[PDB]
Write a protein that binds this ligand. Sequence first.
Ligand code: HEM
Ligand code: HEM
Lengths: 183, 174
Amino acid sequence: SISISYSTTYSGWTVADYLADWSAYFGDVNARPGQVVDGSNTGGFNPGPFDGSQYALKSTASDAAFIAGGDLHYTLFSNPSHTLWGKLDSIALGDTLTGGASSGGYALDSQEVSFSNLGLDSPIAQGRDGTVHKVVYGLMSGDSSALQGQIDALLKAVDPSLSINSTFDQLAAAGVAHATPAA
Amino acid sequence: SISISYSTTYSGWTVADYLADWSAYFGDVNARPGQVVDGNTGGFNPGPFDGSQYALKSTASDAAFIAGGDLHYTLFSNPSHTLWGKLDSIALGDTLTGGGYALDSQEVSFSNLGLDSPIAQGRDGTVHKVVYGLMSGDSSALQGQIDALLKAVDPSLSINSTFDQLAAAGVAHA
Ligand code: HEM
Ligand code: HEM
């Protein structure tokens, strides 16, 4: 079953509302006035260059960032071309990337929400139609819609009364989610 | 002015014939005799989307290149998917190492290219055309720029000059 961590900052938010906010912030720092854009320009595969246990990317319009964790592979020009595939265990969303292979992995300076124990696995044979590819490809431009669809399905699998319209508070009460430090 | 280094293997080759051979080999390992594919490696240094180098190896063979300068890739920023900035050098050879990046077998390098494309030109920039072409082993854009630079030293020089002739003209070095 999916497990979720959320910053205390977002306790009262629905998952959908949170994802819309992260996506808006990825598109424009001014969706969160008061923020600065000064994160290191870092990211990629860990260890890379085209495979790793993490793939991480930061916006260049803001410090919004994600980290995909699992056992991931990118085909580049090999068939099926431009496919990210493998096992996707977690998606963590927040602000500012730090780290990399040389310091124990990528991290977020502020982790806002992390969706873990996802159990997603896309074989190479599915190419760009794989769920892993669609989720991560969306996030590279700040589009959380594919991620949102998967989170909704995974929550409903726990209990059909849970959904992306549940608040993090409600998911905690249901035993799926727990709070982490302020963002 | 442009400066060229070349393996003596290509002393009597013309620049155009060498580029055609590297491109052919980028496309098919069988394009050269007795070669084996055994080198995916490359990217920006430092990256992820900007660097003093961008390097890539073929998937069909170990043919590879390294672009050197002050390079930027826009990803989704307008104009989207544009590689721009200053391109000072292109090195061509076989098999990538490192990540600065280097070639196991460096065959030819073209340096002091003096190319500079602003972001506003988007994918029409010369830098973009040169490097993007080489990502699929297409050396035509590179070749046209080399030809212009050679003629700027002297109109009698060209991509149909041999490397030895360019050495005699003070532009190339074995
Ligand atoms: C890791 C470093 C990466 C590099 C160097 C890279 C490189 C490229 C290049 C050069 C192209 C253009 C190909 C062309 O038309 O000439 C491309 C296209 C594409 N890339 Fe990647 N990419 C990377 C990562 C990713 C990741 C992680 C994803 C997905 C999660 C992705 C998804 C795609 C897609 C979907 C296309 C368009 C395919 C099409 O519609 O033809 N890329 N990439
Ligand atoms: C540095 C890592 C790179 C990544 C992560 C990357 C990623 C991508 C992605 C995801 C797309 C598809 C866009 C979409 O479907 O909305 C794309 C397309 C493209 N990429 Fe990149 N790319 C990289 C490097 C490069 C480089 C270095 C060049 C040029 C030298 C390049 C040239 C292109 C071009 C021209 C397209 C559009 C292809 C088309 O629509 O025909 N890419 N890239």
